[PDB]
């Protein structure tokens, strides 16, 4: 049944929760069955979070060889991407919530860490790699659920990765994704210190047929909104900073591609490797795609509003 997976068998779910397959192989969890609550307030609370980093408890479960994110989202908080084990401090949320969630038959228990790096991700940085590693030696099954809000703004796709980091003693085997990502100066060094200590879960999504019908019917009156983006008007001088950043974003490449140091490699420090040109690459891609946003928005609005027919 389509509802066969929405079935939260607290029996079965908490069974595999106490199953501890990870202590036998820390690569058991290959899947991540998610209900779209993750997308829900993960997305709109990374975006509504402005640029303020956040943390806390995810709802969820486990099924077969699968971590399950019933929930993930953001705080109106900060400090994540630099907090010594940030996420913990928001668990008070379902220190209460899940509890009397059981009072409505939400007999689930706490499973994970909601969070958002508004504008630049949802993950655990250098100090939060202390967070991530320590807690997966604290809290396994634990995940680095990773999706970037403004990346998912200028990207059109949810790059979700459930990153069970490779615990200390457990190296990446054959399957360690280790999603390399352009990090600010604060944590790029420690990512290089820990970029290959995590793998991703095969993050699938589960729903009901009512869910599909609701999204279709959503579109069935959102299309009017579609031709009203109305995307250029939103970032009038935004892109200026973007541009003034983007060339500096490009100077990012410059920053890591400027150098006279001949010799054999990077031969002093990680530069490294000719550099940050990939940083400016993602920068140019996102900024020209947001230009695509603005232009398709206003132009297709002209295509429909300004002139269609009588």
């Amino acid at each position: 049944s389509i509802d066969e997976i929405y079935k939260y068998d607290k029996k079965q779910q908490q069974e595999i929760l106490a199953a501890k397959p990870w202590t036998k192989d820390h690569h058991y969890f290959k899947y991540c069955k998610i209900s779209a609550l993750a997308l829900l307030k993960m997305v709109m609370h990374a975006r509504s979070g402005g640029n303020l980093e956040v943390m806390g408890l995810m709802l969820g479960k486990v099924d077969g060889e699968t971590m399950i994110i019933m929930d993930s989202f953001a705080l109106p908080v900060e400090g994540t991407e630099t907090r010594v084990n940030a996420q913990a401090a928001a668990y008070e949320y379902m220190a209460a919530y899940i509890e009397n969630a059981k009072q409505v038959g939400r007999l689930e228990n706490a499973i994970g860490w909601y969070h958002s790096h508004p504008g630049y991700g949802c993950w655990l940085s250098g100090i939060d790699v202390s967070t991530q590693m320590l807690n997966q030696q604290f809290q396994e099954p634990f995940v680095a659920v990773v999706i970037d809000p403004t990346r998912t703004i200028s990207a059109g796709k949810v790059n979700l990765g459930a990153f069970r980091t490779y615990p200390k003693g457990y190296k990446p085997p054959d399957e360690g994704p280790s999603e390399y990502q352009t990090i600010p100066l604060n944590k790029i060094e420690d990512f290089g210190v820990h970029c290959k200590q995590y793998y991703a879960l095969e993050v699938s999504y589960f729903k009901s047929s009512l869910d599909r019908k609701l999204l279709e019917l959503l579109w069935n009156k959102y299309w009017v909104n579609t031709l009203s983006s109305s995307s250029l008007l939103t970032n009038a001088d935004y892109t200026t900073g973007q541009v003034f950043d983007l060339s500096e974003k490009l100077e990012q490449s410059e920053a890591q591609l400027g150098r006279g140091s001949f010799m054999l490699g990077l031969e002093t420090h990680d530069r490294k490797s000719e550099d940050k040109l990939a940083k400016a690459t993602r920068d140019s891609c996102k900024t020209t795609i947001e230009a695509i946003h603005g232009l398709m928005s206003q132009v297709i609005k002209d295509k429909l509003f300004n002139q269609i027919n009588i």
Binding site: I300, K303, L304, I308, N309, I310
Partner: protein, 206 residues
């Protein structure tokens, strides 16, 4: 809203002479310029096309006709008040505004047989003031910018044109929007091949 029933009982109660009164009321009723369904009463049908068929004639003028018609036909129709006459004037103006997004000043200056800007703008502002019209006069263009027009009349049996018409507008949006849509679709298709090849390499790595 009140006037429709108001006239309804009037047509029921009032004819000819009584009519002269009702007609006097009808002339004076904004929005109640055209009879449509309202004329469906046999009483008014007789009252219309009656001895004072000319009254019905002005009714039609409200439906189809214009103030310039009166300009030609000062005599043909029943007489009106300055208020009513300028009313019909606004009628032609709103009609023209329907035709042109911005009707030039001289358009109505000639159409209404108007002399100049003072009265011209006064009446125009009055028309917009009723909130029938939006925007403002187009000073640069010597026209009238308008967002929308408030429904005054039936204007007699238009069903053919109006019904014909809805889809046309829809078609305009449909065509342009579709073009962008397909371009996106093809783009997504490229996405598929790109992701597809990416997946293929994925397969290769094992």
């Amino acid at each position: 809203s009140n006037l429709l029933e108001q006239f309804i009982l009037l047509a029921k109660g009032t004819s000819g002479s009584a009519l002269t009164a009702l007609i006097s009321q009808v002339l004076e009723a904004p929005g109640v310029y055209v009879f449509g369904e309202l004329l469906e009463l046999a009483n008014v049908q007789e009252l219309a096309e009656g001895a004072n068929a000319a009254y019905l004639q002005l009714l039609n003028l409200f439906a189809y006709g214009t103030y310039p018609d009166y300009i030609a036909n000062k005599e043909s129709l029943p007489e009106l008040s300055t208020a009513q006459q300028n009313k019909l004037k606004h009628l032609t103006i709103v009609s023209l505004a329907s035709r042109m997004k911005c009707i030039p000043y001289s358009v109505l200056l000639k159409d209404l047989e108007m002399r100049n800007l003072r009265e011209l703008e006064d009446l125009i502002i009055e028309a917009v003031y009723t909130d029938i019209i939006q925007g403002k006069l187009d000073q640069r263009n010597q026209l009238l910018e308008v967002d929308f027009c408030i429904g005054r009349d039936i204007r007699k049996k238009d069903i053919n044109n109006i019904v014909k018409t809805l889809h046309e507008w829809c078609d305009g949006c449909e065509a342009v929007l579709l073009g962008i849509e397909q371009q996106v679709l093809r783009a997504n298709q490229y996405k598929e091949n790109h992701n597809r090849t990416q997946q293929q390499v994925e397969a290769e790595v094992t």
